[PDB]
Design a protein around this ligand. Sequence first.
Ligand SMILES: *[C@@H](C)[C@H]1/C(=C/c2[nH]c(/C=C3N=C(/C=C4\NC(=O)C(CC)=C4C)C(C)=C\3CCC(=O)O)c(CCC(=O)O)c2C)NC(=O)[C@@H]1C
Ligand SMILES: *[C@@H](C)[C@H]1/C(=C/c2[nH]c(/C=C3N=C(/C=C4\NC(=O)C(CC)=C4C)C(C)=C\3CCC(=O)O)c(CCC(=O)O)c2C)NC(=O)[C@@H]1C
Ligand SMILES: *[C@@H](C)[C@H]1/C(=C/c2[nH]c(/C=C3N=C(/C=C4\NC(=O)C(CC)=C4C)C(C)=C\3CCC(=O)O)c(CCC(=O)O)c2C)NC(=O)[C@@H]1C
Ligand SMILES: *[C@@H](C)[C@H]1/C(=C/c2[nH]c(/C=C3N=C(/C=C4\NC(=O)C(CC)=C4C)C(C)=C\3CCC(=O)O)c(CCC(=O)O)c2C)NC(=O)[C@@H]1C
Ligand SMILES: *[C@H](C)[C@H]1/C(=C/c2[nH]c(/C=C3N=C(/C=C4\NC(=O)C(CC)=C4C)C(C)=C\3CCC(=O)O)c(CCC(=O)O)c2C)NC(=O)[C@@H]1C
Ligand SMILES: *[C@H](C)[C@H]1/C(=C/c2[nH]c(/C=C3N=C(/C=C4\NC(=O)C(CC)=C4C)C(C)=C\3CCC(=O)O)c(CCC(=O)O)c2C)NC(=O)[C@@H]1C
Ligand SMILES: *[C@H](C)[C@H]1/C(=C/c2[nH]c(/C=C3N=C(/C=C4\NC(=O)C(CC)=C4C)C(C)=C\3CCC(=O)O)c(CCC(=O)O)c2C)NC(=O)[C@@H]1C
Ligand SMILES: *[C@H](C)[C@H]1/C(=C/c2[nH]c(/C=C3N=C(/C=C4\NC(=O)C(CC)=C4C)C(C)=C\3CCC(=O)O)c(CCC(=O)O)c2C)NC(=O)[C@@H]1C
Ligand SMILES: *[C@H](C)[C@H]1/C(=C/c2[nH]c(/C=C3N=C(/C=C4\NC(=O)C(CC)=C4C)C(C)=C\3CCC(=O)O)c(CCC(=O)O)c2C)NC(=O)[C@@H]1C
Ligand SMILES: *[C@H](C)[C@H]1/C(=C/c2[nH]c(/C=C3N=C(/C=C4\NC(=O)C(CC)=C4C)C(C)=C\3CCC(=O)O)c(CCC(=O)O)c2C)NC(=O)[C@@H]1C
Ligand SMILES: *[C@H](C)[C@H]1/C(=C/c2[nH]c(/C=C3N=C(/C=C4\NC(=O)C(CC)=C4C)C(C)=C\3CCC(=O)O)c(CCC(=O)O)c2C)NC(=O)[C@@H]1C
Lengths: 266, 172, 172, 172, 172, 172, 75, 162, 162
Amino acid sequence: TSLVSAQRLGIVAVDEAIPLELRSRSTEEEVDAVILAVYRQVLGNDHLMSQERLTSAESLLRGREISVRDFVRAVALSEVYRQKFFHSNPQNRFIELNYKHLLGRAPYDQSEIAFHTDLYHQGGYEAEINSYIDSVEYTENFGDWVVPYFRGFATQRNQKTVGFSRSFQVYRGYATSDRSGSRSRLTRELARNTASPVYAGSTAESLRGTSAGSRNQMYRLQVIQGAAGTRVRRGKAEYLVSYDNLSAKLQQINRQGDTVTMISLA
Amino acid sequence: MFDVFTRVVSQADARGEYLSGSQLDALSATVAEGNKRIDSVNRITGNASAIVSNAARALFAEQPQLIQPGGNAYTSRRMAACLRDMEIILRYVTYATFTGDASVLEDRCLNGLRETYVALGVPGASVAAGVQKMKEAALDIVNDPNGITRGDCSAIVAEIAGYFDRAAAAVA
Amino acid sequence: MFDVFTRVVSQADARGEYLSGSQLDALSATVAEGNKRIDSVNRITGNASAIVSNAARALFAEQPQLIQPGGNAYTSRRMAACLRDMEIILRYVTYATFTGDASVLEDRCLNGLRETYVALGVPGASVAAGVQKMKEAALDIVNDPNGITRGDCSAIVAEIAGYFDRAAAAVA
Amino acid sequence: MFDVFTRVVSQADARGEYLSGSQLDALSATVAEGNKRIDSVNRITGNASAIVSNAARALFAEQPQLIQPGGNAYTSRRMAACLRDMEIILRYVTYATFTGDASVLEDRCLNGLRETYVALGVPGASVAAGVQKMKEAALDIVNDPNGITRGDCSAIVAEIAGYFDRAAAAVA
Amino acid sequence: MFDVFTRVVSQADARGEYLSGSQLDALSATVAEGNKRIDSVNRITGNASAIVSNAARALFAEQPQLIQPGGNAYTSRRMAACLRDMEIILRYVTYATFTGDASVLEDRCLNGLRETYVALGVPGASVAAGVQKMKEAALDIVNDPNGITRGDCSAIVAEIAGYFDRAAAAVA
Amino acid sequence: MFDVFTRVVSQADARGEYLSGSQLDALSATVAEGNKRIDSVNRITGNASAIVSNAARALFAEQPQLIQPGGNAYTSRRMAACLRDMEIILRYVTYATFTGDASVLEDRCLNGLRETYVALGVPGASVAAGVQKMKEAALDIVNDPNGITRGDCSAIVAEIAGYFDRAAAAVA
Amino acid sequence: MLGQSSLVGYSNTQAANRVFVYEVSGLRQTDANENSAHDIRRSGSVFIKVPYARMNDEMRRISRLGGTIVNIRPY
Amino acid sequence: MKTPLTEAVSTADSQGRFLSSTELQIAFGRLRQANAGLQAAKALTDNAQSLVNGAAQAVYNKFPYTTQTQGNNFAADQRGKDKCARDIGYYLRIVTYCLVAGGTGPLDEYLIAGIDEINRTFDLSPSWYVEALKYIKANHGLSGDARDEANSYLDYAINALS
Amino acid sequence: MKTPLTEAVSTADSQGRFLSSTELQIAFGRLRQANAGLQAAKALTDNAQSLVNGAAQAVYNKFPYTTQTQGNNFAADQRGKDKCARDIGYYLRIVTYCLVAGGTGPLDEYLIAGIDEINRTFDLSPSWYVEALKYIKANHGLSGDARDEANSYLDYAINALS
Ligand SMILES: *[C@@H](C)[C@H]1/C(=C/c2[nH]c(/C=C3N=C(/C=C4\NC(=O)C(CC)=C4C)C(C)=C\3CCC(=O)O)c(CCC(=O)O)c2C)NC(=O)[C@@H]1C
Ligand SMILES: *[C@@H](C)[C@H]1/C(=C/c2[nH]c(/C=C3N=C(/C=C4\NC(=O)C(CC)=C4C)C(C)=C\3CCC(=O)O)c(CCC(=O)O)c2C)NC(=O)[C@@H]1C
Ligand SMILES: *[C@@H](C)[C@H]1/C(=C/c2[nH]c(/C=C3N=C(/C=C4\NC(=O)C(CC)=C4C)C(C)=C\3CCC(=O)O)c(CCC(=O)O)c2C)NC(=O)[C@@H]1C
Ligand SMILES: *[C@@H](C)[C@H]1/C(=C/c2[nH]c(/C=C3N=C(/C=C4\NC(=O)C(CC)=C4C)C(C)=C\3CCC(=O)O)c(CCC(=O)O)c2C)NC(=O)[C@@H]1C
Ligand SMILES: *[C@H](C)[C@H]1/C(=C/c2[nH]c(/C=C3N=C(/C=C4\NC(=O)C(CC)=C4C)C(C)=C\3CCC(=O)O)c(CCC(=O)O)c2C)NC(=O)[C@@H]1C
Ligand SMILES: *[C@H](C)[C@H]1/C(=C/c2[nH]c(/C=C3N=C(/C=C4\NC(=O)C(CC)=C4C)C(C)=C\3CCC(=O)O)c(CCC(=O)O)c2C)NC(=O)[C@@H]1C
Ligand SMILES: *[C@H](C)[C@H]1/C(=C/c2[nH]c(/C=C3N=C(/C=C4\NC(=O)C(CC)=C4C)C(C)=C\3CCC(=O)O)c(CCC(=O)O)c2C)NC(=O)[C@@H]1C
Ligand SMILES: *[C@H](C)[C@H]1/C(=C/c2[nH]c(/C=C3N=C(/C=C4\NC(=O)C(CC)=C4C)C(C)=C\3CCC(=O)O)c(CCC(=O)O)c2C)NC(=O)[C@@H]1C
Ligand SMILES: *[C@H](C)[C@H]1/C(=C/c2[nH]c(/C=C3N=C(/C=C4\NC(=O)C(CC)=C4C)C(C)=C\3CCC(=O)O)c(CCC(=O)O)c2C)NC(=O)[C@@H]1C
Ligand SMILES: *[C@H](C)[C@H]1/C(=C/c2[nH]c(/C=C3N=C(/C=C4\NC(=O)C(CC)=C4C)C(C)=C\3CCC(=O)O)c(CCC(=O)O)c2C)NC(=O)[C@@H]1C
Ligand SMILES: *[C@H](C)[C@H]1/C(=C/c2[nH]c(/C=C3N=C(/C=C4\NC(=O)C(CC)=C4C)C(C)=C\3CCC(=O)O)c(CCC(=O)O)c2C)NC(=O)[C@@H]1C
């Protein structure tokens, strides 16, 4: 997005990112940069140890034996990818990680969760992973030579609006990685076809004045509430409370049977 | 998505019963007015660029702070995004008009748009005002009596206006 | 995931000391229990389709409302997803039995299953009832005395029963 | 919240029929274990302070970075908050033991606790380690065979172990 | 909030260290600057209404679109809100100058102000322009040589400038 | 991101006004400082490995809980990740020095870093302590008068110190 | 001619342990790739190494984009 | 959910373009077909009970072993016969939905997807349902456009099962 | 953080008013005290090691049972002695912070709040820490304003513990 929304949302680096294309007759440093970009984006910005590097796959990429898409596929099918994104993760979290790493976006629909779940159950991890890389979406956006990059913050064709909002649930910042087993943030949002408010970068903070307590910190409590007292006006509720009233607010939410969806510093 | 027929179909399967005579006659009534629905879709489409541009000009005239430097419509990139959002909303309104159901408009366009605009800082009230101007314009083309067979399109006009109301409610 | 051995290893590495003698003898006792562990895994695996189908049949018999139109197991795809869920739960129970540790069952299957079900409207209590049906069906299969070397498999049966209960508790 | 009886009542009421003979017998079996359940609750309650203090000492010994300056348990105010959190988890685990159902622990203690610890910078993994320490001490105290009518309390001990695992899994 | 002394204290406590000789010497240097800091606070406070009023008049004179009908400063309530905002920014700048730390300005005033302004359509750039007007107006008042002991106030002028620029950066 | 020139350019474009004489003169003054800014970047870069290694050694000597088993800098992978974080922070501080603006730190290096450290359980205060060690070493290297043209580099050193402090406050 | 180590999936199907080289020509701008973010760099003979299990996909991909499969050779 | 209108919008939205004359002709084709589809569904609905019982009887006739062999998957008792009649009624009802919808979308969404898993895990022969669908074809008594569209849905189900 | 300046700003901010002469006099009083506080902090810091060791010995002398009775809460072993010296060092360091800050704010935020829950949970006698603070009072060697302000913080800790 433009700068004025980008600084607020903390997506300036994503907006100014340039797609990396491995051209013909590329030099050694270009292949090095392409390999580094693939490792950064497919492995979700983890500190990749040299012992976890795919030496044979990057050799084939260097020697023009395979394309960038094939190297992306080799990294995605690698046991390193399995260990940090599949073997200790629930299936819904795993496929949103696949969507972020391979297509650069958040899941659009619960049917996309229904897909890749049956596909896993019928054809294994390899077929399920190949679905993303062989998809029509991967071909027009990245092709055989462009490193995949995150696209959820920009308006795409055949895109649902929720994708942009849901993007901030899967991209938590430039200095973030997908490293810690964790559950998806999009489960209820995808299942019930909703959208969650975006609280990223500086968007989450709210005015404090003299209303915040001793340590001048407000917390936003997003809860799901029903009538258990006073009339409930909305199913969704947001509560801004100081630190000193955080335990009391939590306990009275608990005794009303209200489900807490999120707590963030505001 | 859902169209006017599949909505009744999905409700009937959940109840696990055949469509009754009344529902079948309601859908027969719906396909009786199918030609007017096609005309309205075609008429909005043929003047989509004029609808978007005239509504944007009116919106920037009534709200000069959008195009004022520092405004959210200032700079070519933001102005281009704004005109694209107007065209996008209009396109999805036509999609909902075509299908006879609002599912395409909600699921693909309207759901998540308020949060997106709040996160972007796009003024939802200004976008809602722009959608009313497109609504006002698009009903004038849809209700234009010149060069079309005479008939009563009040029902389809109300349906189109309802879709535009959903859009305006969603952005704000 | 962890197995019965790596679980002790990870705790020891975090504490930064070698496994004590007692931990080594405990793992050796697990080793002496290994053939019966493999037999139980093989027996549940060999009857897995029968286990899932019979448990599902019994579950739909006492809960006709699952398969009633509008029910959560109605329509072919939902019913197939339901049978898949039974099969998935049974498979990770066998994985947990094989490893001697519940981490694969917890991380891959049970983590997030409850709120997935709650979000989607899949009745977790009914899933728990189905898992309980697979429980005794598989425990009779594991404890079947003919065509196997005799011995006490009560400890293995208790461990497999615990995995099934953990799954039943997680989905509800 | 639900207790062991109201849990199956809630499941039956959704399904709209009476508790079957099997469900009533399972509940009578729960009634037959009630004395042991009251003993386990009583034994943990009588040693709550010992459990909390010993678990905290073991945790800060194994994870010294919690109590060095700049650590999250450093300063008296944060150490007291941490001891209070040990106390709150143990108390709600006993509530779950008393009711025979994990709903009180989930709805009143674990509801939003991981998100709360993330928002505050409290290390959830270290909270889970402390809960695991409380678990081992409490299960030992419940299994102590001195000064009590002897009997097999493995089922209630397994149930209590499950509540502690739920707490440890929710915080981390 | 922090003042100039407790900011250094909090950093030391996080490190678990006594203040070094250089930090105590730096604190002694800012103690020797305390009289000048009090004069700056006194001079801005004693001219606060004039600073706000002249800055606001200049801002609308150079940005007439704010006070034109439909503009964000149009109507007496929004005009009053704008003036109040100016006085609020200036007051927290004096708080920060008094304390010697921007924590009070950042935590109580600036945090979330940009989100509020974006959500309301308050143009942050013109708020930043208005704060910039209060900036040199207050800096010339602090630097007025008449009726005060002569001495170099360059450090305190630079610090107050930083608080003003920090407020301007937050709103824009 | 912005450099020292585009920062005032973006501010001016939001105001929709040309850069005034004072802004242009301030930028010219920044240009006369450019050689020393390039020298500071070059000196930190040429000693980056020594800065990281010495700072890490000092940090682990002061906080030995990090490197003992179970600590967050224990194991080679975790230690190498810690070393990479130190080098990455130093690299982005050089970027900020080179550009004259802090936006590269907020946009990239500190964008979600605190969230990352809380999620993984990395002690942020220890990271802030490590950043301070790199701060004192890098400022000493920049201020070394041997083998360079003599001059006053206090302003660039103060700016570099601000970048280091902002990184430390981002994680503390 | 290398590649089979990484192109063939880690599944040990004997059928899947077969890769083939596709020669494609005339990769034009068509209505199928109007919204392609990347641009076509070569329209002459390009060589794509395809494992057996993806030959169904790739030829479809080639056929939507106007490419002419002129030859297919065992690796 | 494959219907002419939803697919026209799906295609247009996938190309990010407004509905042109191509989509208008799609809607025109849906309009020409809709009345025949609606009369087809009504005729099947009014004749649903005789069609379902006759289809069940035809399957029992062609596969007599279904009525004396004991087993959960067979109809030798009343419970199996009830399940058989219910399944054929599901087939008949979802076909009427396709006639209402104008495409195989109801069949794809509600019946076709996962039917292979179901017939295998509960060892139901798809040949039973093929004969049931064949009986409905031979005895629905539709003519013209209604018959053609209804037979296409019934043949779509048959080809899915075979 | 209870400091003259932060509290002055806080009171003014709740009334929403600018800093008047009252807040300026608070700042003037803070300035009058601050240099003495800074030298008090420097003297305590330079003598910190002997003060902490001497305070620990005074507690061990007054309560000999702490060095000879087994238990986690006592200092009969090296682990307990290290914890004790660390606690007294914590006390001394936060007292220097108070002298720097000009108020009991560091003691309140870092040490005083929750200390009674600590001493109860870990069966630590507050009398031990009172004796340590009394030793520090008697041995810091400060005079004048430095002594008065430092004794105020040390007596504040003593009164909290008793
Ligand atoms: C309200 C929407 C306006 C209106 C509409 C209206 N149209 C018709 C009739 C027809 N219009 C069409 C449409 C098309 N034929 C084409 O080939 C194309 C391009 C693909 C289009 C858009 C058709 C086929 C008909 C039927 C034949 C005819 O020419 O009349 C009617 C008459 C009733 C009907 O439903 O057919 C009406 C009412 N008329 C108005 O007064 C409104 C301004
Ligand atoms: C596992 C938990 C341990 C265990 C328990 C156990 N307890 C009983 C029996 C009883 N205990 C009580 C308890 C109480 N009486 C009181 O007045 C109070 C205070 C309110 C308490 C806590 C009672 C009433 C009984 C029944 C009479 C009796 O004294 O025996 C049993 C016996 C079986 C039963 O269910 O009655 C058992 C097994 N025994 C062990 O070995 C574990 C270490
Ligand atoms: C830059 C800020 C200007 C400046 C300041 C300056 N002030 C002093 C000295 C004093 N100022 C005061 C202030 C007050 N006394 C009061 O009773 C009140 C009301 C509560 C106030 C605000 C005091 C007490 C002093 C010291 C005694 C004296 O009056 O001289 C100095 C002198 C050096 C010093 O810091 O003590 C300076 C430099 N001088 C300028 O030229 C700037 C325009
Ligand atoms: C504070 C930063 C220290 C300092 C710096 C300083 N440097 C110069 C002058 C120059 N430095 C350079 C730099 C380079 N030339 C190269 O080719 C390379 C490698 C690409 C570098 C880094 C240049 C070009 C100059 C100008 C020529 C000259 O040598 O004078 C100055 C002098 C003032 C100026 O701005 O030129 C200063 C002050 N000096 C100190 O004492 C600090 C330790
Ligand atoms: C070292 C001083 C301390 C420490 C560090 C530590 N960090 C991690 C893990 C990560 N560090 C980062 C940070 C970045 N990655 C980037 O790309 C950027 C530039 C924008 C930054 C700032 C991230 C994202 C991670 C996540 C994991 C990853 O592998 O990338 C670890 C590893 C933790 C673990 O392995 O579980 C560690 C150890 N730890 C200490 O104890 C020191 C105080
Ligand atoms: C114009 C009337 C108003 C306006 C608009 C504006 N919008 C954006 C940015 C985006 N718009 C969307 C919306 C969609 N994307 C889709 O794919 C769909 C269809 C399903 C929709 C509805 C999104 C997601 C964005 C952000 C991503 C992108 O820009 O591509 C902007 C730009 C904001 C910025 O800072 O760049 C603008 C300006 N702004 C006004 O002031 C008008 C009132
Ligand atoms: C059958 C006994 C009950 C039932 C099941 C049912 N489940 C779903 C949907 C999902 N189930 C899961 C769970 C998993 N998928 C995995 O891949 C893993 C293993 C790693 C697990 C644990 C998920 C993620 C879903 C959602 C995605 C999907 O649709 O497949 C459904 C479908 C719900 C819907 O269509 O909305 C059903 C029907 N339903 C019952 O009524 C039984 C009690
Ligand atoms: C101790 C094992 C670890 C630890 C703990 C720690 N927690 C907090 C702060 C809070 N803890 C809670 C949790 C609850 N409050 C309740 O009322 C209940 C029942 C619903 C629970 C479970 C809350 C809400 C807070 C914040 C508000 C409050 O304290 O009242 C802290 C303090 C953090 C801070 O002061 O900033 C600490 C230290 N820290 C560790 O390092 C241990 C692993
Ligand atoms: C004046 C230079 C510009 C301007 C201002 C303006 N602000 C508002 C509304 C609000 N301002 C605040 C800010 C604060 N409230 C506080 O308590 C504090 C301290 C923590 C601050 C900084 C808030 C919260 C509001 C909203 C609530 C309220 O109206 O009081 C308005 C009114 C907007 C509206 O539509 O009502 C205005 C006009 N507007 C300009 O055009 C100037 C450039
Ligand atoms: C009748 C042609 C033959 C027959 C039938 C029979 N069917 C079942 C069981 C099931 N039938 C279905 C089918 C569907 N469920 C749906 O939701 C839909 C889509 C809307 C369809 C087509 C399913 C899923 C089952 C299993 C679950 C259930 O019992 O409902 C049985 C019983 C099998 C069992 O093990 O209980 C039988 C007997 N039997 C014959 O002999 C006929 C030739
Ligand atoms: C020394 C005077 C006597 C003594 C000391 C002793 N203390 C502990 C344990 C703890 N001390 C504290 C105190 C603090 N922690 C803080 O962060 C601060 C504020 C900055 C204070 C004052 C705490 C929290 C503990 C418990 C946790 C920890 O170990 O840090 C012990 C050990 C008790 C135990 O059970 O482990 C001891 C021995 N013992 C004597 O005999 C002296 C007379």
